Design a protein that fits this description.
alpha+beta, Cytochrome C3, 5 helices, about 15% strand, binds heme C, binds (3alpha,5beta,12alpha)-3,12-dihydroxycholan-24-OIC acid, transport, heme, PpcA, iron, heme binding
Length: about 70
């Protein structure tokens, strides 16, 4: 399957799966979540544990605006 881009108005956000599969062997951080995770995602989650927060906790991955968002 293909990578997805989130159409944030300030700039597209790429989500490269290959890097995540390699760097996050605990697949259940994202997969086999209960129902509601597709509807639930948004800016609050993205800027929290959905994206940025995991990067902070794992000590790796982008944490600056322009590292995630790109027109
Ligand atoms: C969130 C940050 C994820 C982590 C950590 C892992 N996966 Fe993932 N996966 C995630 C998304 C948002 C998607 C759909 C978009 C995409 O890039 O495909 C997927 C997709 C898969 C797939 C289908 C891949 C394909 O057909 O090309 C598989 C088989 C899969 N994910 C498995 C998987 C495993 C085994 C992981 C841990 C090592 C893993 N994923 C991490 C989100 C995230
Ligand atoms: C842990 C549970 C994570 C979640 C949820 C998300 N990301 Fe992530 N990401 C994670 C790690 C440990 C890393 C480092 C990977 C590396 O090899 O350096 C990353 C990396 C990225 C990257 C950069 C990939 C690269 O080629 O360097 C991007 C662009 C990125 N992450 C974006 C991103 C987004 C948009 C997420 C939410 C939708 C997201 N990540 C979730 C760990 C985790
Ligand atoms: C990745 C780890 C990110 C970092 C660092 C920052 N942002 Fe972000 N942002 C990210 C995603 C995946 C999303 C989309 C949420 C979704 O609905 O899918 C966003 C969202 C925004 C928005 C809202 C965009 C919209 O609703 O169209 C804004 C205005 C925004 N982000 C700005 C922003 C700034 C200023 C940042 C640095 C302070 C920043 N983001 C960091 C992913 C990530
Ligand atoms: C559920 C995990 C981990 C975050 C958490 O613990 O809640 C999060 C991390 C990244 C999230 C995905 C990012 C891309 C997509 C954004 C859509 O708007 C909703 C579906 C997708 C496919 C999201 C589904 C789910 O919300 C994920 C996989």
């Amino acid at each position: 399957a293909d990578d997805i881009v989130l159409k944030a108005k300030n700039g597209d956000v790429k989500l490269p799966h290959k890097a995540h599969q390699k760097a996050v062997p605990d697949c259940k951080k994202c997969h086999e979540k209960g129902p509601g995770k597709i509807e639930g995602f948004g800016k609050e989650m993205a800027h929290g544990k959905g994206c940025k927060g995991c990067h902070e906790e794992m000590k790796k991955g982008p944490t600056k605006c322009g590292e995630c968002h790109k027109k």
